[PDB]
Each structure stands twice: as structure tokens, then as C-alpha cells.
Amino acid sequence: MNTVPFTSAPIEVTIGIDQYSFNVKENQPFHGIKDIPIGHVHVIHFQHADNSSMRYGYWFDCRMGNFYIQYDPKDGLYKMMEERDGAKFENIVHNFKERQMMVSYPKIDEDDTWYNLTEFVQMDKIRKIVRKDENQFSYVDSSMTTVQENELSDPAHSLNYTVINFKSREAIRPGHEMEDFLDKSYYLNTVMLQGIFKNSSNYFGELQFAFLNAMFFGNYGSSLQWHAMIELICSSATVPKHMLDKLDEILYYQIKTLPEQYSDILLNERVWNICLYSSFQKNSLHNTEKIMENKYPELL
Amino acid sequence: GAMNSSNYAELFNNDIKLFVDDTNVYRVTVHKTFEGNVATKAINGCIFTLNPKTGHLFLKIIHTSVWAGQKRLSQLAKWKTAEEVSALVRSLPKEEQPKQIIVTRKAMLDPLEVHMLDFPNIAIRPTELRLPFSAAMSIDKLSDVVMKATEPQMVLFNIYDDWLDRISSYTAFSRLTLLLRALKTNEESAKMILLSDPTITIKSYHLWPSFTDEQWITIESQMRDLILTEYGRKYNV
Numbered sequence: 001m002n003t004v005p006f007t008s009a010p011i012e013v014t015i016g017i018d019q020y021s022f023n024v025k026e027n028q029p030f031h032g033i034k035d036i037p038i039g040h041v042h043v044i045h046f047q048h049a050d051n052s053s054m055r056y057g058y059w060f061d062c063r064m065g066n067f068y069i070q071y072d073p074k075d076g077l078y079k080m081m082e083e084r085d086g087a088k089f090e091n092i093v094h095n096f097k098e099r100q101m102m103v104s105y106p107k108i109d110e111d112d113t114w115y116n117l118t119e120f121v122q123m124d125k126i127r128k129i130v131r132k133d134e135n136q137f138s139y140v141d142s143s144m145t146t147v148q149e150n151e152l153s154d155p156a157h158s159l160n161y162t163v164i165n166f167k168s169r170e171a172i173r174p175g176h177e178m179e180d181f182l183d184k185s186y187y188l189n190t191v192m193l194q195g196i197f198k199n200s201s202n203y204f205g206e207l208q209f210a211f212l213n214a215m216f217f218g219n220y221g222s223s224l225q226w227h228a229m230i231e232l233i234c235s236s237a238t239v240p241k242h243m244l245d246k247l248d249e250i251l252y253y254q255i256k257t258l259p260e261q262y263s264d265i266l267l268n269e270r271v272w273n274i275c276l277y278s279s280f281q282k283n284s285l286h287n288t289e290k291i292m293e294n295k296y297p298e299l300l
Numbered sequence: 301g302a303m304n305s306s307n308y309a310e311l312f313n314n315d316i317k318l319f320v321d322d323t324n325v326y327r328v329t330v331h332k333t334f335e336g337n338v339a340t341k342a343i344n345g346c347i348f349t350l351n352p353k354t355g356h357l358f359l360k361i362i363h364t365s366v367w368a369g370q371k372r373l374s375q376l377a378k379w380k381t382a383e384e385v386s387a388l389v390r391s392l393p394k395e396e397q398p399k400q401i402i403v404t405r406k407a408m409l410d411p412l413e414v415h416m417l418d419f420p421n422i423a424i425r426p427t428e429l430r431l432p433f434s435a436a437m438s439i440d441k442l443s444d445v446v447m448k449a450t451e452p453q454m455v456l457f458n459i460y461d462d463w464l465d466r467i468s469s470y471t472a473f474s475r476l477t478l479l480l481r482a483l484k485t486n487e488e489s490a491k492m493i494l495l496s497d498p499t500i501t502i503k504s505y506h507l508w509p510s511f512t513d514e515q516w517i518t519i520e521s522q523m524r525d526l527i528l529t530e531y532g533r534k535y536n537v
């Protein structure tokens with residue numbers, strides 16, 4: 001179990017760690033989060049009490065270093081940093097743990113939610129989507145645009161998701177126009193899986209990361225990417241059976257975790273009705289269709 | 301964006317553009333089978349591709365053999381249309397290729413866009429106008445070449461005959477759309493109007509009769525009467 005200490009909490013803020021969140025008052029004696037499960041990526045995210053504009057946060061994996069949070073009064077945000085002095089960090093964490101100044105990562109033993117949401121998400125792949133090579137952790141916020149959004153403006157601050165475009169030469173083989181547009185199996189299996197992602201695990205990892213950025217930061221380009229990656233599978237007549245079974249599990253847990261009051265902006269009516277009721281895979285997502293119909297029948 | 305009454309003179313500027321109408325590509329008769337079920341039999345169709353500024357009509361004849369052994373023919377017809385339009389554009393010299401293609405039905409947008417990916421600078425546009433180009437097969441010479449075809453064929457016409465010698469493209473298009481709307485609303489009456497006087501003939505190299513300027517005004521007035529009437533006979537007014 002690992003720890004992300006905080007130097008202090010000078011401004012009132014709602015702090016998220018994965019799917020949990022707690023409120024910290026201005027200058028409250030708060031010094032971080034302990035008992036963080038090892039083996040998973042994690043996200044720690046912030047919404048200031050004064051300016052609910054810009055949710056922002058950091059993806060990290062405690063196996064990759066010792067990270068802590070300090071408030072920067074010049075840039076006006078809580079920053080993640082890496083501590084290179086491992087003896088200083090152990091001493092800092094122990095002192096605060098002794099003074100009971102840390103919240104405990106509040107995982108129920110029965111509860112596999114975070115695993116199920118991050119099963120295929122790897123820090124190394126996150127760091128390729130979010131390019132800031134000098135840090136082991138990745139910053140994301142509500143406003144960052146995607147590479148595909150920039151084509152339709154600061155590149156260093158972009159989300160470099162894999163570009164998916166159904167009306168593009170990459171997606172459409174000359175002479176198979178109708179075939180490839182109506183059945184995207186070529187584009188899914190050859191172009192994306194064999195060519196770009198290499199295996200379905202990396203595809204699912206990017207899909208899961210896009211959803212999590214959509215949910216936690218309200219990041220619109222991430223939501224676009226998540227739906228595009230779902231639609232590409234559902235619009236393929238030929239998909240490996242293990243992938244369809246895994247997609248049903250992935251989407252089930254995503255829909256289960258989605259805040260009900262955000263379903264209006266986080267779910268695209270067209271994509272979901274097409275995927276569940278018209279696509280080739282309309283009969284392959286039993287668990288996902290069942291939770292969608294019981295939790296969000298209005299959208300459908 | 302979409303083509304409508306607001307931006308109507310755009311059709312007659314000097315940017316090359318084509319209308320594409322796919323209505324008459326997939327044509328069937330519906331009939332009973334010996335067992336009393338219903339079946340279709342295809343008949344020859346055509347793509348109607350028109351330059352509204354010049355009157356040049358690229359009439360691609362769609363022979364029934366295209367459909368042999370195929371499924372979902374109404375969907376295939378849209379993609380066949382887009383394939384043939386794309387092939388036409390590629391066959392034209394660069395300086396004759398259109399800058400815009402306007403489809404008369406929105407369901408042609410995605411098929412044509414996908415077939416024209418190689419041409420990113422050619423805009424594919426819908427229209428809010430309800431153009432009467434389906435009535436093209438009420439023009440006798442056009443119907444005759446489509447029905448006689450024994451194989452795929454492209455036939456070139458000028459749908460304005462020689463009218464542009466005396467009138468502008470705007471006026472020619474307005475005359476064409478009036479004639480076609482008339483033929484669409486009441487083919488028999490419209491055709492009687494056009495041929496009633498035996499002394500006005502259709503030249504061998506033309507589609508419509510050789511009316512004088514004065515006779516065209518009379519004809520046009522008769523077509524407008526027809527359309528307003530039928531719009532009564534229809535809505536009882």
C-alpha cells in the first residue's frame with residue numbers, strides 16, 4: 001500500500017482519488033492519502049471551491065516513484081511532484097501517518113470497481129497519449145483538446161489519442177468503398193488492431209482511459225474518443241469473440257459507475273442506440289444492454 | 301452548406317458544378333408470382349448528372365444486369381451511383397472537374413463523400429430545393445435510350461437544346477424545372493401542351509420542340525396553369 005503526501009492544503013478544494021472524493025477546507029490540516037492499492041494506475045483530481053471551472057488532475061502509478069502534492073500560489077493549483085530522496089519521503093510519510101493527518105484510500109474488500117475500470121490501462125500508454133516526458137505522472141484537465149480536435153491549438157498540451165475517422169482513406173480501401181463503410185472490420189482488425197494498437201489490450205486501454213478522462217474531467221474530446229472506439233467495434237461484422245465478451249464487461253462497469261446526473265452530457269444517444277439496437281453487435285453486449293435499459297431507458 | 305432559394309444564383313456562376321439525381325437508378329415493376337406472392341422485376345435505369353450552367357447532361361444508363369445476384373438493391377443503388385459519378389469525375393480533364401457536386405437526395409451524401417475521398421477539394425452538398433429531375437424519364441428521347449440499352453452506356457446530351465443562344469442559364473434552368481415539374485405532376489397534359497401544334501417539331505439533335513421566343517412564353521404559361529390546377533384538383537381549391 002502506497003502514499004501520496006500533501007505539503008499542505010492552502011485553498012478549499014474537493015479532492016478525488018479514483019472514484020472517491022472528499023472536501024478539504026481552506027488551511028485544513030490535511031497531509032495526503034494513504035493505503036493506495038498497488039497494482040493499478042490511479043488518478044488524483046481537484047476542483048477548487050471558488051472556481052469549479054477546470055477540474056484537473058494527475059495519472060500516476062506508485063510503483064514508478066514517490067509522488068507528493070504541493071500547492072503553487074503563483075500558478076494557482078495543486079501540483080504533483082516526484083521526491084528523489086527516498087529516505088526523506090519515508091520520514092515525511094511516517095511523521096504524517098503518526099500524526100494521523102492522512103485520509104485512507106477507502107476501498108471495500110468486495111469491491112472490484114477500480115480494477116474493472118482500469119484493467120487494460122497502463123502508465124506507459126498514458127504517457128504516450130499525454131506527452132510530458134520529464135515527469136512520471138500525467139496531467140489532464142477539462143479543457144485539453146485532442147489531436148483530432150486540433151485538426152478541425154497548443155500541441156504540447158494535447159491528448160494524443162489515436163485518430164479514428166470513418167470517412168477517411170485509412171478507413172476505406174479503394175474499390176471496397178461500400179463494403180468498408182458499412183462493415184468496418186477491415187479498419188478495426190487490420191488497420192487499428194494489427195497495425196496501430198498491435199493487440200486488443202492496448203485498444204481497450206485507450207478506450208478505458210478516454211472514458212475516465214471524460215467522466216472525471218468532463219473532457220469533451222475524450223468522450224468523443226470513447227464513443228468512436230465503441231462504435232468502431234460495434235460497426236464491425238467480424239470481431240474476435242473474446243473481444244466482444246471483454247467489451248461487454250468494460251462498458252457494463254463504465255455505465256455502472258457513471259454519475260446518473262451526468263448521463264445527459266456523457267452519453268451520445270446516436271452511438272448507443274445504434275450500437276445496442278442496429279449494429280452488427282446489437283446482440284453481443286448483453287450485460288451492457290441490460291444495465292443501460294434499467295439505468296438510462298430515456299436515452300434509448 | 302445546403303442549397304436553397306437563398307443561394308440560387310450560385311448555380312449560374314463560373315464555378316463548375318453538377319447536380320446528381322439517383323431517383324431513376326433502381327427501377328422496378330411489382331407483380332404477383334404464380335404462387336400469389338409478390339416479386340419485383342428490374343428495368344433499366346439511369347443516373348441524371350447535370351451541369352446547370354451549360355446544360356450538359358451525363359446520362360449513365362444502368363442496365364439491369366448490374367443487379368444480378370445482389371442483395372439490398374436500394375442501398376446498393378446509392379453506392380453504384382456514387383461509384384459512377386466518381387468514375388465520371390476521374391475521366392474528366394482537371395479543368396473540367398466540378399468544384400461542387402449537389403445531390404438531390406440526402407441519402408447520397410455519405411456514399412458520394414466516401415467515393416470522392418481522393419478529391420478533398422470537391423464539395424459534396426445537399427439541397428433544400430425539391431427538384432423535379434425524377435421526371436427526366438418523361439422526356440421521350442431520354443426514356444428511349446435507357447429502355448433500348450443492352451449494356452452499360454454513357455450518353456451525352458444538352459438538356460437546354462440551343463436555348464442558351466437566346467436566354468441566360470438562369471432562365472434556361474427555370475424553363476427546364478418548369479417543364480419537368482409539369483411532366484411530374486400530370487405527364488399526359490404536359491405532353492399534350494408540348495406537342496399539340498403539329499407544325500412545331502423536335503429537331504433530330506434536340507429534346508424539346510423548336511418554339512419561338514413568343515411560343516415559349518405561351519408554353520410556359522400553360523405549364524404554370526397545369527401545375528396550379530393539379531394543385532387544386534389535388535387539394536380541391
Ligand SMILES: C[C@@](N)(CO)c1cccc(O)c1
Nearest residue numbers: 005006007068070083089092
Ligand atoms: C514539503 C516537502 N516539499 C519537503 O519536505 C515535501 C512534502 C511532502 C512530501 C515530500 O516528499 C516533500
